[PDB]
Design a protein around this ligand. Sequence first.
Ligand SMILES: [Mg+2]
Ligand SMILES: [Mg+2]
Ligand SMILES: [Mg+2]
Ligand SMILES: [Mg+2]
Ligand SMILES: [Mg+2]
Ligand SMILES: [Mg+2]
Ligand SMILES: [Mg+2]
Ligand SMILES: [Mg+2]
Ligand SMILES: [Mg+2]
Ligand SMILES: [Mg+2]
Ligand SMILES: [Mg+2]
Ligand SMILES: [Mg+2]
Ligand SMILES: [Mg+2]
Ligand SMILES: [Mg+2]
Ligand SMILES: [Mg+2]
Ligand SMILES: [Mg+2]
Ligand SMILES: [Mg+2]
Ligand SMILES: [Mg+2]
Ligand SMILES: [Mg+2]
Ligand SMILES: [Mg+2]
Ligand SMILES: [Mg+2]
Ligand SMILES: [Mg+2]
Ligand SMILES: [Mg+2]
Ligand SMILES: [Mg+2]
Ligand SMILES: [Mg+2]
Ligand SMILES: [Mg+2]
Ligand SMILES: [Mg+2]
Ligand SMILES: [Mg+2]
Ligand SMILES: [Mg+2]
Ligand SMILES: [Mg+2]
Ligand SMILES: [Mg+2]
Ligand SMILES: [Mg+2]
Ligand SMILES: [Mg+2]
Ligand SMILES: [Mg+2]
Ligand SMILES: [Mg+2]
Ligand SMILES: [Mg+2]
Ligand SMILES: [Mg+2]
Ligand SMILES: [Mg+2]
Ligand SMILES: [Mg+2]
Ligand SMILES: [Mg+2]
Ligand SMILES: [Mg+2]
Ligand SMILES: [Mg+2]
Ligand SMILES: [Mg+2]
Ligand SMILES: [Mg+2]
Ligand SMILES: [Mg+2]
Ligand SMILES: [Mg+2]
Ligand SMILES: [Mg+2]
Ligand SMILES: [Mg+2]
Ligand SMILES: [Mg+2]
Ligand SMILES: [Mg+2]
Ligand SMILES: [Mg+2]
Ligand SMILES: [Mg+2]
Ligand SMILES: [Mg+2]
Ligand SMILES: [Mg+2]
Ligand SMILES: [Mg+2]
Ligand SMILES: [Mg+2]
Ligand SMILES: [Mg+2]
Ligand SMILES: [Mg+2]
Ligand SMILES: [Mg+2]
Ligand SMILES: [Mg+2]
Ligand SMILES: [Zn+2]
Lengths: 214, 120, 114, 122, 62
Amino acid sequence: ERTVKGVLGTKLGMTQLWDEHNRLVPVTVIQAGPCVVTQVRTPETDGYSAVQLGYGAVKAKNVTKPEAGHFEKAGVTPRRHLVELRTADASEYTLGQEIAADVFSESDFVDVTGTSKGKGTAGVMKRHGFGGLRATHGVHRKHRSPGSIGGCSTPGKVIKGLRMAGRMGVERVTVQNLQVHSVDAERGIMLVRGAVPGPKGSLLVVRSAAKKAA
Amino acid sequence: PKPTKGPRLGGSPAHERIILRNLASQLFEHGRVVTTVTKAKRVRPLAEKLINRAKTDTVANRRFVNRTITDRGIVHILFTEIGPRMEGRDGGYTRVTRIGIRKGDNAPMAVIEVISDKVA
Amino acid sequence: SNIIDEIDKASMRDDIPEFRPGDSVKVHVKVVEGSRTRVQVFSGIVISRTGGGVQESFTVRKLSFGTGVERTFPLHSPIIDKIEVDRHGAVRRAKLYYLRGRRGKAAKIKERGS
Amino acid sequence: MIQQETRLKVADNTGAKELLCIRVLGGSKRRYAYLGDTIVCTVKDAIPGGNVKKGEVVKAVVVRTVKSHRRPDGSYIKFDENAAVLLKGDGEPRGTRIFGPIARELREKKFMRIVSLAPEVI
Amino acid sequence: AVPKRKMSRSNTRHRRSQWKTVATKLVTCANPACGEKHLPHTACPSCGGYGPRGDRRQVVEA
RNA sequence: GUCCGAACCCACUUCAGUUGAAAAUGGAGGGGAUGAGUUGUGGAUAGGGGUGAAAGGCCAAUCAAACACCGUGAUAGCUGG
RNA sequence: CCCUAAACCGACACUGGUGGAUAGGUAGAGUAUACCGAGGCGAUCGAGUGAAUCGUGGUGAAGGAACUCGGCAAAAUGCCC
RNA sequence: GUAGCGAAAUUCCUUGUCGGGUAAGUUCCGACCUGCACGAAUGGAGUAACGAUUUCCCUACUGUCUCCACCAUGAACUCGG
RNA sequence: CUCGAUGUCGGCUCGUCGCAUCCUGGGGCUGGAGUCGGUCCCAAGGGUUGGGCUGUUCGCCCAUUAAAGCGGCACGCGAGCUGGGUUCAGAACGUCGUGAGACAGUUCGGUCCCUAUCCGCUGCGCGCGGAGGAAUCUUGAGAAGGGCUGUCUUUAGUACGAGAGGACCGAGACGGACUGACCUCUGGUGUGCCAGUUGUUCUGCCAAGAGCAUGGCUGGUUGGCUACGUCGGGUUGUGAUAACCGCUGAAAGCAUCUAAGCGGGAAGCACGCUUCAAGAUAAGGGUUCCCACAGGAGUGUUCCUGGUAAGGUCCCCGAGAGAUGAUCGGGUUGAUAGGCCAGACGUGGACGCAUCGUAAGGUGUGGAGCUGACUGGUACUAAUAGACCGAGGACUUUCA
Ligand SMILES: [Mg+2]
Ligand SMILES: [Mg+2]
Ligand SMILES: [Mg+2]
Ligand SMILES: [Mg+2]
Ligand SMILES: [Mg+2]
Ligand SMILES: [Mg+2]
Ligand SMILES: [Mg+2]
Ligand SMILES: [Mg+2]
Ligand SMILES: [Mg+2]
Ligand SMILES: [Mg+2]
Ligand SMILES: [Mg+2]
Ligand SMILES: [Mg+2]
Ligand SMILES: [Mg+2]
Ligand SMILES: [Mg+2]
Ligand SMILES: [Mg+2]
Ligand SMILES: [Mg+2]
Ligand SMILES: [Mg+2]
Ligand SMILES: [Mg+2]
Ligand SMILES: [Mg+2]
Ligand SMILES: [Mg+2]
Ligand SMILES: [Mg+2]
Ligand SMILES: [Mg+2]
Ligand SMILES: [Mg+2]
Ligand SMILES: [Mg+2]
Ligand SMILES: [Mg+2]
Ligand SMILES: [Mg+2]
Ligand SMILES: [Mg+2]
Ligand SMILES: [Mg+2]
Ligand SMILES: [Mg+2]
Ligand SMILES: [Mg+2]
Ligand SMILES: [Mg+2]
Ligand SMILES: [Mg+2]
Ligand SMILES: [Mg+2]
Ligand SMILES: [Mg+2]
Ligand SMILES: [Mg+2]
Ligand SMILES: [Mg+2]
Ligand SMILES: [Mg+2]
Ligand SMILES: [Mg+2]
Ligand SMILES: [Mg+2]
Ligand SMILES: [Mg+2]
Ligand SMILES: [Mg+2]
Ligand SMILES: [Mg+2]
Ligand SMILES: [Mg+2]
Ligand SMILES: [Mg+2]
Ligand SMILES: [Mg+2]
Ligand SMILES: [Mg+2]
Ligand SMILES: [Mg+2]
Ligand SMILES: [Mg+2]
Ligand SMILES: [Mg+2]
Ligand SMILES: [Mg+2]
Ligand SMILES: [Mg+2]
Ligand SMILES: [Mg+2]
Ligand SMILES: [Mg+2]
Ligand SMILES: [Mg+2]
Ligand SMILES: [Mg+2]
Ligand SMILES: [Mg+2]
Ligand SMILES: [Mg+2]
Ligand SMILES: [Mg+2]
Ligand SMILES: [Mg+2]
Ligand SMILES: [Mg+2]
Ligand SMILES: [Zn+2]
C-alpha cells in the first residue's frame, strides 16, 4: 500500500561529526553499495508488488547453478545478499537496474533494519530487566532469580508468555526516523545519524521512514 | 599475544601463564612436543613471537627473551639454532598436527614442532 | 577501517599545537550568548589526553574561586578558536588524576628542561 | 547526579551551610537532579546568626555537580563539590551573593539573577 | 524433586534410545605404501605421516 | 580470676553445607587465653540412682528415669491385614 | 611398620578428633603473616568450554543506609614512636 | 504500701499527655501521675568499671541500596571413564 | 475434602484478571458566568512515586505527582527468597494459683530440607512430512508486542466577568517515566597491556630479570561487555462503535433520534507501527537448477537394492554465532585464523652508552621501548586428503 525507497548496505562502525549548530552527532557509517534489481514481483504473477534487490560481492565458485540461473535471468553478476523491498511502485523498476546510495538525500528520514547483536542465553535479569533479590539480608542462593512464576491451585499452571531466561539477540530490529546525515554516492558511503542494529559487517536495509518523522 | 577468552588452562590464569611458558621452553628444547590440541594451538602465538624476537641477535633481545623462557640453554638454542633457521621466513615458524586421542580421557592430542627446513 | 579514517579527516584541524598532559594551556572557547559571539578563555593544566582521530579529547583543570573545575574538550571541536601552550610541565605519567587530591606547591608542576 | 539524601554545600550567603535533598522536582519517579534542576531540601547546617534555621524545608537549584555534564557540542564540565542556591519559591535567590563558579546550564532562560551574581560562569 | 511415578517402558525407551554415539568415519592414507585408515586431518597411526600424495611429512616416528 | 594477641580451649554472627568432606562441620570474622585455665595417664560415683556454677542438662551419636536380657507372644473399647 | 594419619577413633583410602618431642633463614614483637631451609609433596578421574544460575573472591561513576525487622554482610579503622 | 521508683523487662486502654531528637519518630530519651496489675534481702532506689546481652542516636565508611555492570574461579554445560 | 501434614502473618520477586475508574479519553444534568467543581453515564489502552514510625496489613505523617484506585487469583506467590510477628524447649516482669504451673499479657533468645519424573512455561535442536530431488527470495491464516503523561509559550489578558480573576477549540517548544537498539561520546570493568613499588626466593655475581604474597599492592588503559551513556519510539490517522447528540418520520392528522431509512461520536474495539509465522499436515507462492540411471524379484506397471546429477553433510580454519545442537563465513580457484610487516589505540621515556652526583639518583641519546582484541597489507603456518548422503521424469483420477 505504501511507496518505499530502499537500499542495501553494510554496517562499518560509528564515528562523530559536528553539524552546522556545532552539536556533536553520532553517525553510523553504512557501505550502501550498488544494489541491482534481481527480481520484480508483480500482482499478476506473485500476487504482490516488490523489488528483490541483490547486494554484495561473492566468489563465483561459491555460487550454485540455481543461483547462477537466477542471476543470469536477471542479467546481472551474482550478489551475496537478496532482499525484497515491499513498495507500491515496484512496476517502475527494471530487471538489472542499478540502485545506488544516492536514493537518499542529505536530510531524508530513514528506517534501518538489521539483525541485532547476540548475547547467547541470558537470564531474566539481563534479557527482561528483572530485579532479583537483595545481595544480603538472608537471601539464600536466589540473588538473580525470577521470583514467583505463577499463583497457586488457581491456575495450576504457568501462564503463556511468562518472561523467563533464554537466548536473546540475533533478531530483526528496525530503528525508525533516523536522519541521513550525508551520502557519498561515488564511493557508496552513507552517514546516518544514530545507532543501528547489528555488529560491524552486518547487512542493513535502509528504507524510507514509514512514519516520516516525529 | 591475544588473551584466551574462556576459562584458562590449569584452573587459574597464573597457572596458564606458567604452563604456556614451560610448554614454549620445552618446544624450543626438543624441537617438537606432544601437548594436546588446545595447548599446542594456544602456545603457537607465544612461541612464534619468541622466535621472531630471536631472529635478530642482540644482548637486549636475549635479555627480553630471557624474561620468558628463563632457561639460558633454551635462550642459546633459540638465538643460535632456531633463530638463524628462519632468516627469510616471515612468520609461521611452527606447525601443529593432530595426532589422535588419549585413551584415559579422550583428550585430542597434537604435535607442535618448529619448522626444521630452511626457507631458502 | 581506513574509510572511517578518511571520512574523519574532513572533521580534523591542523592548527593544534604540540602539548602533553601536564602542560599549562589556554583554551579560547567561543561561547554564543544572546545574539553575540564571544571568546572565553579556560586556562589550566592538561590532566588527560584520550586519543584517536576525531575522537581525540583532552581535559583541562583550573582552580577558580577556591574550587576545581575540569573541562573535557574534543580536540577537533569547532568551539575552540585556538589553543595556546604556556608552560611545558615535567610529569611522569599520562593521566594526572592525582592532582585532584592536591593543592598549593604540591599541585605545581615542574618546568621541562630545568 | 543529586538524589534523595544527597547532602550539598550551599553557594549562597543565606547562612545555610549544608542541605539534604528530600525530593528532586520535575515529575513522578524522577531520580536525579543535574545542573539547573530544582530540588526540595532540608537545612542540615546553618550559621547561628542567620535568617535560615536548621531543619527548614527550602527549595534550591543545583549548581556544581561532581559527576559531569554533557553539552551539545560534545564537551563536559565537572566540579569538585555539589552545590545549591536557595530559592524564594518563584525562582529567585534568597541570598544576595553567589560563591564559586556557576554552571552555564543555569543560563538556560531560567536563572538570571544567579548568573549575574556569579563570579565565574562556566 | 522426586519422580512421582514409574516411567513407562515406552517413554523410558523413547528417552534412552537417544543416548547413542556415531561411528568414526575414517579416511584412507594417501601414502601408497600404507593405505591404512586414519582420522581426517590427523596423522596416520600406521605410518606416522601427513599430507597429500605429493608432499608427505612425518609427524610420528611410529 | 589485669590488657592486646598466637598455640590451646570455646562457639557469638554470617555464608555454605543440608542424599554433607562431616549423624553438628567448613570458610570469614568472634570470646577466653596465669587462671573458677587447659590437657595426657590411671582411678571413684550406676538407673528412681549418679552427677549437675542448675539447661531437666549429661550418664557411650534420640534420657521428665540409660542399655541388655527375662516376665513376654505385656495390654490396646484403637489402626491395619 | 603407621603414627598433628590413606595403617589410630570416626561404617570409607572420610576437608573431623588424637597426648609428647625436635623445630633453621630473611622481613617481623612474635611459635602471627609472607617467601624460603632441613626434608617432603604435586593431593588418589581427566580434557575442554567466555551460556544462564549457584558458591568463592575482585573492582566500581554520582550518591552514601535512601536497604532492611535490624547497617545483616562488607567497607572504613588498624602497626611503632 | 513507708522511703524510694513509676506508660517501667511491670501500663489493658495506648501510638496516654507534654517536651527533645527527625522533613516526617507506634521505637528512643526526659518528665507527669490516672500504679488495669511497682515497692523495700522472691530485696527498693542508685551506681564507676565491665558485656560476642537488649534498645535509640551521631559521625566515619561503604554495592546494603538507587541499580546494577564487569573480571577470574569450584560446580553447572560438552566429550571419554 | 484434607490430621499415614492442604505450611500460616507481613514484606521482596514475578505477574495475570475484574471494574465497583484514582489519572488520562468521551458525554448528560447542574443551585455549569469564567477559572475551578459536584453528580452519574460510557470507558480497563497505558499509567498509578520516594521516604519517617511500627513485624506488621492497616493507619498517621513528610516531600512529591496527571494520579498516588479498589478488589480476585489457597486473605496469588516459602520444592521462589525472608523470618521481623505468631504456635516449641531457656529466662525475667505483672497477674492468677498452696503448688506443679498458667495467661490469644508483656520482655530478650530461639535448625525454614529437596540433584525436577509428568503437566505447565522460557529457549534451543534432531526426525519425518509437505507425491521427483534441490537452491533462493517470499505471501500471510494466525500469534505477540507497543498504546503513559506533564510544564511552558502563543491564540489572548481574548471569550466570560461589577471586579478580582481568566478560558474552550487550534499551533509550537522542552520535559518525567517506560522501552528498543547501540558503544561514536561519558562512566564502570579489566587475571591483558604499560609503568611504579614492599617482603622474600632464585637466574653464580654486577647489570638485567623471573616465581610467590588477592593480578601482593599501587597508577593508568585499547578491544569486548555494559549504563550512569548515546540515538530512536509511543503517533499523526482510518473503519465500525459506546455513553451521548441528531436528520427525515409514521404507527398515534400533533409529537417522537426509530418503527422504514440516514448521520456525527472515546486513550476503548479492529487496523495503521514493530516482530514471529505454511507442522496454516489446508504443509502455500515466484524464480532458478538437475534430470528419463543400473540390477533383481515382479504382477496395471508395483516393490526392493545400487551408483550418481543438481544440491548438501561429515572434516578442518574461525566469529559478527554459541551451554551443546544450531547459525554465519572461509577451506589453496584461499586473506578464515594465527604468525609477519606497517599503522592506530595504551603506557610513558626500555636496555646500552655518554655525562653530572659520594650514593640513592638526575640529564641526553630519544614521544624511547614495550604492546592485546582495532585497521591495512602479506600464503610464512594451519585450513591436507578424502568420504557419505542425495532424483528419476517422479502414485492415482478427472479436466483442459
Ligand atoms: Mg540489586
Ligand atoms: Mg549469596
Ligand atoms: Mg508453593
Ligand atoms: Mg577476557
Ligand atoms: Mg576442571
Ligand atoms: Mg599470583
Ligand atoms: Mg595516546
Ligand atoms: Mg514425556
Ligand atoms: Mg586475663
Ligand atoms: Mg578480656
Ligand atoms: Mg560449653
Ligand atoms: Mg572405672
Ligand atoms: Mg523448665
Ligand atoms: Mg547421648
Ligand atoms: Mg522418656
Ligand atoms: Mg517408671
Ligand atoms: Mg504375665
Ligand atoms: Mg584423614
Ligand atoms: Mg606425619
Ligand atoms: Mg578408620
Ligand atoms: Mg586437643
Ligand atoms: Mg620462623
Ligand atoms: Mg605460619
Ligand atoms: Mg629439601
Ligand atoms: Mg610425608
Ligand atoms: Mg581431587
Ligand atoms: Mg591429580
Ligand atoms: Mg580417594
Ligand atoms: Mg581500575
Ligand atoms: Mg560506589
Ligand atoms: Mg568514588
Ligand atoms: Mg559522607
Ligand atoms: Mg530506613
Ligand atoms: Mg535513619
Ligand atoms: Mg523501605
Ligand atoms: Mg558486621
Ligand atoms: Mg571488613
Ligand atoms: Mg503497650
Ligand atoms: Mg508512648
Ligand atoms: Mg512527642
Ligand atoms: Mg520487709
Ligand atoms: Mg516483685
Ligand atoms: Mg521480700
Ligand atoms: Mg546502670
Ligand atoms: Mg560423563
Ligand atoms: Mg499422603
Ligand atoms: Mg463502568
Ligand atoms: Mg489492561
Ligand atoms: Mg496467601
Ligand atoms: Mg524471631
Ligand atoms: Mg519457658
Ligand atoms: Mg502467691
Ligand atoms: Mg496476520
Ligand atoms: Mg572503540
Ligand atoms: Mg575509562
Ligand atoms: Mg641487581
Ligand atoms: Mg589488602
Ligand atoms: Mg571501554
Ligand atoms: Mg421531532
Ligand atoms: Mg496453530
Ligand atoms: Zn598411513
